[PDB]
């Protein structure tokens, strides 16, 4: 199929383990610490991944920063959603950190994790493929609606290139449904909604000051 889609597949970062501290008692603080640590490490690999997306590294460093500051939590959430598609009512944050409903309630995350499971339900019913996942993650970055963009035209061109790759992929692989690309685009509002909820939830955990957070995670929470 499509070269952009095959490129994004090879660019996909390796799996990251959560490694919850086995010496620490189970608690909301432990679960939130574990998840913020996991996000901080994944943010480093997301920054390296973005540089493989055609055209991203040609933007100004200000525009690269702006796109990542608006999209980072969408990119993190799509990863959790993709890993969870084979599971039932469980979120695969990592292979060693799978959260069921009881664990979500214990971490104060039931409402957020229920919205993430809504994303999973719709992608399961649409039989989301890895090809579509990686292309939607790149589109989410390009379409993140930063208020701070310098080169509006170059960011539109990045959107168009990635949109064209999704449409060409679907035209070739899914002739049974000539509107499947647009169905995939219509999944992006719920991702935006769930990301905004997540950022607000963890910004409030930051303000409460009971969960240690590493520098990069903090930098991205603070950006908004």
């Amino acid at each position: 199929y499509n070269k952009i889609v095959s490129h994004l597949l090879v660019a996909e970062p390796e799996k990251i383990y959560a490694m919850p501290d086995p010496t620490v008692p189970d608690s909301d603080i432990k679960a939130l610490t574990t998840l913020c640590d996991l996000a901080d490490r994944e943010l480093v690999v997301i920054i390296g991944w973005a540089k493989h997306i055609p055209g991203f590294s040609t933007l100004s460093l200000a525009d690269q920063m702006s796109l990542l500051q608006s999209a980072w939590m969408e990119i993190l959430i799509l990863g959790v959603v993709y890993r969870s598609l084979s599971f039932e009512d469980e979120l695969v944050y990592a292979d060693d950190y799978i959260m069921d409903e009881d664990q979500s309630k214990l971490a104060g995350l039931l409402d957020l994790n229920n919205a993430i499971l809504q994303l999973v339900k719709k992608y399961k019913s649409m039989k989301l493929e890895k090809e579509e996942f990686v292309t939607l993650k790149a589109i989410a970055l390009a379409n993140s609606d930063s208020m701070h963009i310098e080169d509006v035209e170059a960011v539109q061109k990045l959107q168009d290139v990635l949109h064209e790759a999704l449409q060409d992929y679907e035209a070739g692989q899914h002739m049974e449904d000539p509107r499947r690309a647009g169905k995939m685009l219509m999944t992006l509002p719920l991702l935006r909604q769930t990301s905004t909820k997540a950022v607000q939830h963890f910004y409030n955990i930051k303000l409460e000051g009971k969960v240690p957070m590493h520098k990069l995670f903090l930098e991205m929470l603070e950006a908004k």
């Binding site: 480093v44 920054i47 460093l61 690269q64 920063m65 990542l68 500051q69 520098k215 990069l216 930098e219």
Partner: peptide, 9 residues
């Protein structure tokens, strides 16, 4: 900015 540092590296 750690974000800027990583984008430059």
């Amino acid at each position: 900015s750690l974000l800027l540092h990583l984008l430059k590296s």
